[PDB]
């Protein structure tokens, strides 16, 4: 299993972006990682759908997947320098053969210009 990411990169402030997580089932989640700082979850979806968020970026994120394509959704609107980071997703799984598994994408730098 490979985690492929896309829909990042540099990006004007006040703008918005839709990273996407391809998965070439089990919950994922949207973290990420600023220099110098800890990860920190932004958003998680449950096989069924519910979701969690960050409580202070629910309002500018949303994480969705669309089961037909097999893609992971991130989008993300009103964006500052505050939000420039390394943006990771994450599906972990427990199966019946295999057991857990735990699978992460080579990662999206986001780079918010002001």
């Known amino acids: 299993v490979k985690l492929q990411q896309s829909g990042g990169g540099s990006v004007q402030e006040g703008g918005s972006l839709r990273l996407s997580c391809a998965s070439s089932?089990?919950?994922m989640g949207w973290y990420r990682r600023a220099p110098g700082n800890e990860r920190e979850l932004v958003a998680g979806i449950s096989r069924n759908g519910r979701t969690i968020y960050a409580p202070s970026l629910k309002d500018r994120f949303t994480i969705s997947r669309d089961d037909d394509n097999n893609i992971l959704y991130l989008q993300m609107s009103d964006l500052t320098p505050g939000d420039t980071a390394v943006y990771y997703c994450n599906l972990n799984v427990r199966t019946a053969v295999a057991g857990r598994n735990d699978y992460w994408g080579q990662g999206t730098q986001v780079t918010v210009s002001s």
């Open positions: 089932a089990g919950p």
